[PDB]
Amino acid sequence: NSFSGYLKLTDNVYIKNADIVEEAKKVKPTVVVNAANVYLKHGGGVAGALNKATNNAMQVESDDYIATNGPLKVGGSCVLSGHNLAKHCLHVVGPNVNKGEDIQLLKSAYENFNQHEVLLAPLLSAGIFGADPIHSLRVCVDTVRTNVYLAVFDKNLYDKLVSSFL
Ligand SMILES: O=C(O)[C@@H]1CCC[C@H]1c1ccc2nccnc2c1
């Protein structure tokens, strides 16, 4: 949890323009959040990048979790190993609003963060899931009560979020 270079947006939400893979390798936080789908198939976006950084160890562990427990629900989560990125990975499923999943479930998705005192995380449902990233930051701020360090890869997006929030 040796985070550096973050801007404090609220009492408990911090933001940095950084690649979450590189933040995780440098900080080795207690918890790194993955933006997952219900079958934990880490094919693209943040999920593909975190899985690639574990050289597919996260995918093999995830397939075993699904074979024993079944898929997650939208708005749900599970805690698995963080491998070389963190002590734990919290795999959280935000709604895929491009496939008709209700945006109201974005609040349920962020509620999972409250089970952990400190987390390194991306914006949920942004990117391939289709939600507006600034709306996702708003739900994060309105919902998460624990300390969250958000890593935003795209500089244009990061600047938009900081200008809209400060
Ligand atoms: O922060 C961002 O710019 C977006 C917002 C939601 C998903 C974020 C993200 C971060 C790292 C990624 N690395 C490889 C591929 N896609 C990624 C996507």
CA of 123 to the centre of ligand 1 (A): 8
For ligand 1, whether the C-beta of 20 sits within 6 Å is yes
61 in Cβ contact with 51 (< 8 Å): no
Other Cβ atoms within 10 Å of 148 Cβ, number: 25
Q: What does DSSP say about strands 7-8 and 13-17: parallel, antiparallel, or unpaired?
A: antiparallel
Question: Which of these, 118, 147, 156, lies nearest to 9 by C-alpha position?
Answer: 147
| Coil vs helix vs strand at 92 | strand
Q: For residues 158 and 5, give the distance between their C-alpha atoms in angstroms, rounded to a whole number.
A: 13
Domains of the chain: 1-165 (3.40.220.10)
Nearest ligand 1 atom to alpha carbon 124: 6
Helix ranges, the chain (H): 20-27, 45-53, 57-69, 105-111, 133-143, 155-165
For ligand 1, whether the C-beta of 153 sits within 6 Å is yes
Resolution (A): 1.4
Question: Which of these, 42, 77, 48, 46, lies nearest to 62 by C-alpha position?
Answer: 42
Ligand 1 pocket test, candidate residues 22, 46, 154, 158, most atoms within 8 A of CB? 46
Experiment used for this model = X-ray
47 in Cβ contact with 36 (< 8 Å): yes
The b/e string for 73-110 (b: 16+ C-beta within 10 A; e otherwise) is ebbbbbebebbebbebbbbbbbbbbeeebebebbebbb
The DSSP-derived string for 29-50 is: -SEEEEE--TT----SHHHHHH
